[PDB]
Structure formats: structure tokens, C-alpha cells
Amino acid sequence: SSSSIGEKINEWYMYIRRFSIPDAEYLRREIKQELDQMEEDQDLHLYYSLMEFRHNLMLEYLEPLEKMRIEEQPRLSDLLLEIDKKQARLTGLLEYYFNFFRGMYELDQREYLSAIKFFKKAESKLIFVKDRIEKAEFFFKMSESYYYMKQTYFSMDYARQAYEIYKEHEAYNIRLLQCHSLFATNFLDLKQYEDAISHFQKAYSMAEAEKQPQLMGRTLYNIGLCKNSQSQYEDAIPYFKRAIAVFEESNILPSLPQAYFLITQIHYKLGKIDKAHEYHSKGMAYSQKAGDVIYLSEFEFLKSLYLSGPDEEAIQGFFDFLESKMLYADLEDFAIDVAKYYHERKNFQKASAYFLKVEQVRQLIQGGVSLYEIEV
Amino acid sequence: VLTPRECLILQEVEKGFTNQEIADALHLSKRSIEYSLTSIFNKLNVGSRTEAVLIAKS
Ligand SMILES: [Mn+2]
Q: How far, in Å, from the CA of A38 to the mean position of ligand 1?
């Protein structure tokens, strides 16, 4: 993994600063081999090249000590200061990548406080990153990360910082488009549905310019999603239909299980069961083809709920599956869907019970953190 | 403060291995063992292999 390789390069650097030769050599070797077995991103390749150079500098500064009597040798700790002093630009760049990659690794480990701390250290080193497009890429990645951590305001703020830089270049309309997608998804979490739609629409027009099938489709899907979240089911249908058409014309297999799911569910909810069934059959098949584990179970769930009675025992297995996967947001939503199914059927005892399930799920620790070395 | 792997190198030194024998035992180049010792000896503040062995043992 790109994320794990960067963290190994981090460890390599810590051994280099200590002049621990065996350790640094072992990591250097393992890292070279791992990168020889992959097409690494440009950021990772550069970080490695920098560290390779820095490792050779370590050896170069050590070399004169070989011929020195011991008392004439400087303390390694001072050698290190000299290196950092005479190679200030290298060091700063290394600090930027070290912290960025450690932050990414911590995020991956779901260590959120730790990720933020490293992301901030990285940002303070951004001055060493000259290319303003590379800066925008950092802000863009911060935006995606805080979208994931649901620090919605910070996510929008970083998207704005990225957008401002992309706006000044002409060859980056695609990234600009994705900044709009970032604004939209954030608006969506804020329930600002019209604002989200409006940005998805902008993104759409841009993706159509760039003739980008995937983005075009996703954009259309997200609009349908917004409509669906407002329970405006009829209004969502045409957008889901258009998205599917786009995905299907090109052969974007990965996107299809999803594109078929909400529209299938909608037709169940609208009581359009023959149409539901056809969407279901197709969506289920696409999921089987792509080998999509999650969507297989979710299409299965639609049957369990809308056709099978409902089948509460199968629904329960599904709920447990989602939870084991930490798909809490979907789990809440599906429990609501079950509650609402029973509600319309005037089965209020069952509805109330699933509404209770919803609250239980909202009580789970979904993104817990840990303080670093704070005494209680 | 030696890493476990640096201690390992020193342990082989105490047993009387040559640099070449340490290299082979640890799958490192001899050159790397030389660098390692220069670093290790500096850290132990000693000026010889024999004397690194003594400070090691205390
Ligand atoms: Mn490669």
C-alpha cells in the first residue's frame, strides 16, 4: 500500500537521523524492493528519492570519522545539526512529506487526533513546496480527509483553498469540477440540499465539457441522491436513469451496482413493483458480475424487506454485517427504511421497534479518538 | 542508545567475528558493517573494536 510504504520511509528517516546504519540499510532495501513491485504515485516516488539522497548524505558525513581518533570526532548529534543546516531545503521538504505521509497513515489507522496533528505539521512546511499546483493538491487531500472525518467546515475551507488555486490555471478544469463535488457533498451532509444540487449541477456541466463519462455519471447520480434524501423519490428517478445510461454506454462496470440500487428501492417505496423487480434483477446481476460484496447484500436486503414479509431474521443478519463493517450511516438509513415500511403498513409496533434500533445505532462509538499522553 | 540491530552487531563483535563474518551473518555489505561500527563506536565513545567490546560489557 502507498500509505504503508510512506510510513516505512518515515521509519527509515528516523533511523537515518540517529545514524543507525543496520536499521536504515534494512529499510532502504525493503522499500526499494516494494516500490519495484508497483507504480507508485509521484509524491511517493519523490519522497523516496529525497530519502535515498538523505541516506547517502548520512553515510557521507560519517565517512570522515573513520580516520579520526575518537576524541577528534564530533558527536553524531552535532553532525545531524550540520546536515540540517547545510541542507535546509532538503530537510524542509523531507519534513513536509514525513508529516503528510504519517498523517495519511494515522488516518488509515483511524487515529484521527493523531492524523490532524501531522497534517498541521505538514501544512506548516508547505512553504517548502514551491509549485502552487502541488499546494492545491495538499489542500484538496485535506478537504477529502476532513470530509471523511466529517469535519465539514474544515473540509469546505480546504476545498476553497484548493479551488482558489485551480481557478487561476486553465488546464485544471477537472480538479475544479471535483472541488465543486467537494462543496456539494459537504452541503449535502449539512442538509443544504439545494446548494448541494446546485454544485453537483455545475460539476455536471464541467464534466460534460471535458467529456468525462465517469464524472458525468457520478454527478448525475449525486443529484438523484440529493432528491432521494429529501424523500422526493419521483424527482430522483430521472437522474438515476440518466446516470445509469451514462455508466452503461461506456463500460463503467464498477459504478453500476450502486447506480441501480437507490432507483430499485425507490420503485419499491412508490409501489411500482414490476418496475422495481426489473431494476432489482439487473442491479443484482451487475453486483454479481463486479463481485461487489456489499451491494449483493444490499440488493438482498431489498427483497428481505419489500417482498419477503418482511423477513426479520435476514434483515437482522444484514444489520450485523453492516455494523461489523462500520457502515453506520447506511445502517441507520436502512433501519429507518424498515421502520417506515412498517409504518405505512399500519404496523406501528414493528415500526416503533425499528425506530428504536435507529437510536441504538446512533449511540455506537462511530469515530472515537484517544488523547496522546494526557493524564487522568 | 543502540537499536536492537546495532546491539546485535556489537554482540557479534564481542564474540570475535570479523566484519566480513558479521556482514554474512546479517545480510549486509561489509562496507555497511564498517559504517555501522563507525557509528556505534562514536555512540559508545570508544576508539577501538577491543575497547568497544569493554564498554559494551558495562
Ligand atoms: Mn515502481
A: 4
What is the rounded end-to-end Cα distance, in angstroms, of chain B? 13
Technique of determination: X-ray
Q: Which domain holds residue A145?
A: 1-376
Resolution stated for this PDB structure, in Å: 2.3
**Domains: count for chain B:** 1
- What's the A48 CA to ligand 1 centre distance in angstroms? 11
Q: Which domain holds residue B19?
A: 1-58
Ramachandran category for residue A211: left, alpha or beta (phi over 0 → left; psi -120 to 50 → alpha)? left
Q: What is the CATH number of the domain that holds B2?
A: 1.10.10.10
Task: Looking at the complex, report in whole angstroms how far the Cα of residue A77 sits from the nearest Cα belonging to chain B.
Answer: 10
Q: Do A23 and B6 touch (CB under 8 A)?
A: yes
Q: Which residues contact A295 (CB under 8 A, 6 or more apart)?
A: A257, A258, A261, A283, A287
Separation of alpha carbons A156 and A146, rounded Å: 9
How many residue pairs bridge chain A and chain B with CB atoms within 8 Å of each other? 49
Question: CA dihedral in degrees (A124, A130, A132, A138; nearest 10)?
Answer: -40
Element (H, E) at A156: helix A152-167
Out of B36, B38, B45, closest to residue A22 by CB: B36
